[PDB]
Amino acid sequence: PALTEAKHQQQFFQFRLSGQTIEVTSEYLFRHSDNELLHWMVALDGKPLASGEVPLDVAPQGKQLIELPELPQPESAGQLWLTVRVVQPNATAWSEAGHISAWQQWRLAENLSVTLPAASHAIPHLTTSEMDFCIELGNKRWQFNRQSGFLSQMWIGDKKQLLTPLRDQFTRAPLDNDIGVSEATRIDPNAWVERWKAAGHYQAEAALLQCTADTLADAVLITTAHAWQHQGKTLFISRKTYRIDGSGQMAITVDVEVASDTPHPARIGLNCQLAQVAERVNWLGLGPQENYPDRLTAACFDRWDLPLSDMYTPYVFPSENGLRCGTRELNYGPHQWRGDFQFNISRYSQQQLMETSHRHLLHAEEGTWLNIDGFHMGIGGDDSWSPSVSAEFQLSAGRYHYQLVWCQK
Amino acid sequence: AALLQCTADTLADAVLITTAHAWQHQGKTLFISRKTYRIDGSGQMAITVDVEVASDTPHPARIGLNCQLAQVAERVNWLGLGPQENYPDRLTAACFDRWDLPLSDMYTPYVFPSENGLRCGTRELNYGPHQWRGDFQFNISRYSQQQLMETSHRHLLHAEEGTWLNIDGFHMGIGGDDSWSPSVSAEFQLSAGRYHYQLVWCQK
Numbered sequence A: 001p002a003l004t005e006a007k008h009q010q011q012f013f014q015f016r017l018s019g020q021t022i023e024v025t026s027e028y029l030f031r032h033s034d035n036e037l038l039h040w041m042v043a044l045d046g047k048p049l050a051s052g053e054v055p056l057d058v059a060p061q062g063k064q065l066i067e068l069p070e071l072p073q074p075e076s077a078g079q080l081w082l083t084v085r086v087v088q089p090n091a092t093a094w095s096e097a098g099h100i101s102a103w104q105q106w107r108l109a110e111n112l113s114v115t116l117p118a119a120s121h122a123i124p125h126l127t128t129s130e131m132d133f134c135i136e137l138g139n140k141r142w143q144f145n146r147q148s149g150f151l152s153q154m155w156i157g158d159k160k161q162l163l164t165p166l167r168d169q170f171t172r173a174p175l176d177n178d179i180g181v182s183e184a185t186r187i188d189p190n191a192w193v194e195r196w197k198a199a200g201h202y203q204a205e206a207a208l209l210q211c212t213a214d215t216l217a218d219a220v221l222i223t224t225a226h227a228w229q230h231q232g233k234t235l236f237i238s239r240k241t242y243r244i245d246g247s248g249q250m251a252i253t254v255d256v257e258v259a260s261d262t263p264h265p266a267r268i269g270l271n272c273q274l275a276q277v278a279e280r281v282n283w284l285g286l287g288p289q290e291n292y293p294d295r296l297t298a299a300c301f302d303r304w305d306l307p308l309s310d311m312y313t314p315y316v317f318p319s320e321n322g323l324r325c326g327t328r329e330l331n332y333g334p335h336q337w338r339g340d341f342q343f344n345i346s347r348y349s350q351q352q353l354m355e356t357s358h359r360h361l362l363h364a365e366e367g368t369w370l371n372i373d374g375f376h377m378g379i380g381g382d383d384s385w386s387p388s389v390s391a392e393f394q395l396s397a398g399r400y401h402y403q404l405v406w407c408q409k
Numbered sequence B: 001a002a003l004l005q006c007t008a009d010t011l012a013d014a015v016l017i018t019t020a021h022a023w024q025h026q027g028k029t030l031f032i033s034r035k036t037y038r039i040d041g042s043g044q045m046a047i048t049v050d051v052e053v054a055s056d057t058p059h060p061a062r063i064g065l066n067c068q069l070a071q072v073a074e075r076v077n078w079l080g081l082g083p084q085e086n087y088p089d090r091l092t093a094a095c096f097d098r099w100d101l102p103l104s105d106m107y108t109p110y111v112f113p114s115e116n117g118l119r120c121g122t123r124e125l126n127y128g129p130h131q132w133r134g135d136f137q138f139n140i141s142r143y144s145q146q147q148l149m150e151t152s153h154r155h156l157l158h159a160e161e162g163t164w165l166n167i168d169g170f171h172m173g174i175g176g177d178d179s180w181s182p183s184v185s186a187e188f189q190l191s192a193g194r195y196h197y198q199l200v201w202c203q204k
């Protein structure tokens, strides 16, 4: 995946936008742009609106100005994105026709959605057992374990949807950059994986603080709190609210506290193993390739649709992989998640990736592991023998907030 | 402000008010604010605020609440950065501790009146019978942001009835590399798009 990031940063055409005018700059020192068009696409949350191509005639170290036509200006809700591609129409000795050599993206206009959703014809019903809070609406059932405090299972008809409960996750299968030169024999305490392991991040057990059900006029409200401890020290606290409304939508609100003096965690999100194994993964966000907070400049905001196999990156030493960032919608089988999040999705658990030394020893697990993070630590890589993740990409904030909506389709 | 949603619910141990406003100007929606007020058996009001800011409007000066209190107390007591005025890009000299000052010292008499007297990184603020807890920046004065904005000299300011309280989840840097061009650096601009902050309002 890193190659695209190299391609994007090393590109020979740099862009600036002012109003509807694009300043293209040439960083070539000897040749004109004698084999280059600029293609441009304007899109509203992935749906294309306007297109077009304009010839490029930039002297070496020169500038060309390009005025766009009066773009489409819809009242419909969403963010408008401009994307430009530089395309070589002709083959070279090193490339074939239609090769893309450079690109750049901008947000244009956003119109926030102000409409209230239409009132539902139905109210979701709460069923209280000693062991469970269960919620029914139509063909759909939700079950919350009152001993654990997690969503244990969801139903569409007789069909169960989960193999593992939906739980918080503050750890990732360590990257080569998290490990450095640390070895089982000779530990390096300065490596991120060792700081994490020493602090109990990987061995932290969840302790239920609160687990409460309430009925509202139009919804059921499940409210929970867990503390993750290691040998007496409280590392993380997660407070959630699950709000299931008449439309079959489950709004999850997460509010996490991280102890100031524990090593900054690798991620703040949820994960679960779903029962479904679908062939395609469709998301609105940065893509199409794998991208991380400190490696997402080559990625672009659009609708992407790839096979599940392409959402796993076969690094020979298995680690956390296949994350996409800045995602507003994710689709997998009947499931849809909405919000503002990072995700990865594969047949391989963070547990299996962490414990397996070679990609050829991995086995597909029963279902599909889904990690949804509100926040993810940078990957670093200025070197691979000392901590390389810059301060801006470490999760030091202390308090974190993220919101998901889980619904069916 | 245009009211979108205003609902009440009764829970086992508390009452929950949920609201949603849109701030508009000539057809353009600039901000949306979704809140939950949760008043529980202990007389404590827990307010959750979730704001959207349009990506193409200028990054706003602050994101918080404000009210005029009836109370005028003689002292202000807070746990956070102080004792002096401090802003996000000017708080290195400030130190985290419990600060107790006269309300006079919570206002900075700049000759040209502006926003002033903010303290940042505060977990607890105490004024008269009121306590607010959370993670916020505040200023507290007898002078509304409106009076300060409309007044050109400090000697023409008049104490209004009661006490104006600004509690911000987030507050833009003050800049100052020069004062004839924008000088607040990107990291101190409110460009995130979605913001969240949480207060609890208390009696003592």
Ligand code: NA
Residues within 6 Å of the ligand: A317, A318, A319, A353, A354, A355, A356, A357
């Ligand atoms: Na491994």
